[PDB]
Design a protein around this ligand. Structure first.
Ligand code: HEC
Ligand code: HEC
Ligand SMILES: [Cl-]
Ligand SMILES: [Cl-]
Ligand SMILES: [Mg+2]
Length: 419
């Protein structure tokens, strides 16, 4: 096709090729700020009701909010068992856990549909977009099927069973009131309209507040501290932090939405294995990220994408209880320190081993060793000092939306609060 629309309301994008089974390659970068969100207010309110309804799990008692706490920027507040164990959300039953850490859902409306784009300084197109860290859902409506029917999360047996359960409650009556009686008879329609309602909620302005001190710096040049400005400088310095090369920002713009702190692209940084995750009880099992989606979509040579994961946005990062797709780090400073010394000090991060412990041998070539600061060899000085790392942490704390600032720690290596 000549064009494709990758975010709601956005200008159509020129398609220059199709990769595998329907993934468009576009001619220009998607600008997430060009999207236009106009969710129907009562539809959004219905989606919010769904989001907080604990009847939607098996056994009952777990809602979306059980892993996406509104008091923590819709990132998980871990159960005591999860905090002591794998550091990813607990599912609907004791001893069952998500396969990955759950992100904040604030700003999720800006995640575009899957597409490829080849920058001027690139030999091949790169993948962007898709929901989940492996991009396996193209839209928010499609995403909903994941947690609802995952035995380790909300654990509904089938769409039919979920439909029967909902149909018997006030939620079923409300859905039938808006959509008509067939939502109580057709399980496919039930799932689809739940997705439409959830999409409206998650696309509402409530779910993209832009209320951080960084945002006040962008809109009004309200001053940050000298330390925070040192961290901002390191963050956009290609020779020190180089963070801006993947966690996109525009600190000279005046619109906060030009700073989402991700380009929604993918890379392979090889964070350490979290052996507390149930799936990793098999030492031959690895969560390989994007290549599972690439295989499903018949992208050519799909294992080139093994160990690739979607670059997360960093807004509200400093109130999370664990970090990276596998929750392996429990402090923000450790995540930043890892970026700086994975390549120079692998034994620190991989239990004395000199190379990655969560990437199969076959896929080690996929790991990024070219981007600063991951491009320095063992025994050479890292790009940044421990003081630089502290300053980066100080800067990342400016990305917390106003209502959540009290959850942040004060010590550079501190953990988010559990009030
Ligand atoms: C804990 C058991 C979960 C429950 C209950 C819900 N979600 Fe969640 N969510 C969870 C994890 C571990 C992740 C990441 C999984 C991965 O493979 O990356 C997610 C992700 C999402 C997303 C995508 C966010 C993104 O890619 O940026 C969305 C939009 C989302 N979750 C929505 C959502 C809904 C609406 C829920 C109730 C129906 C729901 N989640 C429950 C963990 C858990
Ligand atoms: C592109 C090559 C990257 C650069 C340069 C930096 N980061 Fe990044 N980051 C990248 C990816 C692919 C991921 C996900 C990895 C995973 O296993 O999940 C990350 C993750 C983060 C995190 C975790 C955020 C969370 O929500 O869990 C943090 C805190 C982070 N990165 C910080 C960070 C800093 C400060 C950087 C400059 C020193 C930086 N990253 C560079 C990809 C890329
Ligand atoms: Cl447990
Ligand atoms: Cl602007
Ligand atoms: Mg490579």
């Amino acid at each position: 096709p000549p064009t494709t629309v990758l975010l709601p309301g956005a200008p159509p994008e020129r398609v220059v090729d199709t990769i595998g089974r329907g993934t468009p390659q576009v001619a220009s970068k998607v600008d997430p700020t060009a999207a236009v969100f106009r969710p129907d207010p009562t539809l959004a309110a219905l989606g919010k009701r769904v989001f907080f309804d604990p009847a939607l799990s098996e056994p009952r008692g777990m809602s979306c909010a059980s892993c996406h706490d509104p008091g923590r920027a819709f990132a998980p507040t871990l159960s005591p068992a999860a905090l002591a164990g794998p550091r990813v959300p607990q599912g609907s039953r004791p001893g069952h856990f998500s396969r990955r850490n759950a992100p904040s859902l604030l700003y999720v409306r800006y995640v575009p549909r899957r597409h490829f784009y080849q920058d001027d300084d690139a030999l091949a197109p790169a993948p962007f977009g898709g929901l989940f860290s492996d991009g396996r859902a193209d839209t928010l409506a499609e995403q909903l099927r994941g947690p609802l029917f995952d035995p380790d999360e909300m654990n509904n047996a089938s769409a039919a069973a979920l439909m029967r359960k909902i149909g018997r409650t006030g939620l079923g009556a409300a859905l039938a009131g808006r959509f008509g009686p067939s939502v109580r008879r057709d399980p496919e329609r039930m799932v689809r309209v739940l997705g439409e309602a959830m999409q409206a909620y998650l696309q509402s302005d409530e779910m993209a507040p832009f209320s951080s001190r960084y945002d006040a710096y962008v809109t009004k040049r309200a001053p940050l501290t000298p330390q925070e400005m040192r961290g901002l400088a390191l963050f956009r310095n290609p020779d020190k932090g180089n963070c801006m090369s993947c966690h996109t920002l525009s600190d000279t713009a005046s619109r906060p939405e030009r700073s989402l702190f991700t380009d929604f692209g993918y890379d392979a940084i090889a964070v350490p294995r979290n052996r507390a995750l149930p799936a990793n009880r098999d030492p031959r099992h690895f969560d390989n990220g994007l290549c599972d989606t690439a295989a499903k979509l018949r992208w050519p040579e799909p294992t080139q994408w093994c160990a690739y994961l979607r670059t997360p946005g960093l807004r509200n990062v400093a109130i999370k209880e664990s970090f990276m797709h596998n929750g392996v780090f429990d402090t923000l400073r450790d995540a930043v320190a890892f970026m700086n010394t994975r390549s120079t000090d692998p034994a620190r991060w991989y239990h004395g081993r000199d190379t990655f412990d969560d990437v199969p041998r076959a896929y080690r070539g996929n790991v990024n060793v070219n981007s600063t600061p991951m491009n320095r060899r063992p025994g050479t000085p890292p790009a940044m000092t421990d003081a630089d790392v502290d300053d980066l942490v100080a800067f990342l704390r400016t990305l917390t939306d106003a209502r959540y600032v009290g959850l942040m720690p004060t010590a550079p290596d501190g953990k988010a609060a559990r009030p």
